[PDB]
Amino acid sequence: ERFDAFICYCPSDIQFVQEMIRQLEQTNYRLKLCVSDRDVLPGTCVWSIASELIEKRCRRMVVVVSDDYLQSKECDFQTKFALSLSPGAHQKRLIPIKYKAMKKEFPSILRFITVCDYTNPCTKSWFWTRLAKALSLP
Known part of the structure; x- marks a missing residue:
């Protein structure tokens, strides 16, 4: 199956990824994010599914x-x-x-x-709009 984006992340960031799911998959954006800890199947290599998927x-x-x-x-x-x-x-x-x-x-x-900066308080209001849009382009 194809995806709109492959979320690369460390374990300690999983929770932010969850928020991404809550903000990009579970909203009107309806994006298909590939979260390795959720959609990458076991038995896969850990470097080839960064070469077949990504x-x-x-x-x-x-x-x-x-x-x-x-x-x-x-x-x-x-x-x-x-x-x-x-x-x-x-x-x-x-x-x-x-x-x-x-x-x-x-x-x-x-x-x-260009990095999508959540930390910036004056820019965060457009974060999910900028990210979603970016992930929705062809």
Whole structure:
């Protein structure tokens, strides 16, 4: 089955992903998010379902960036694979998200891609609108 986006995230960010489900799948947006801890089946490889799903079965990939995310090798692999699919962010396939105040730097590999910043109080009002729309484009 195909998806609109593959949510890349660390375990400690699962809960924000749940909010994404509550804000993007369970609303009028009706987006089909691929949450690995929910839709990726067991028995799969953990690097090939970042190469079959992300590449062919998902149009975009929402990275849930955070301090915990930097420390989890799996999501780093999946993000670098994203950038392999579209180095330069030409096809607009990698949506970074900063939903929490970070004590570490933003990944130096995503400096030039526009991040959806929940933390910003004056911008959050458009977050779910910007994200949803972005994930709904062809």
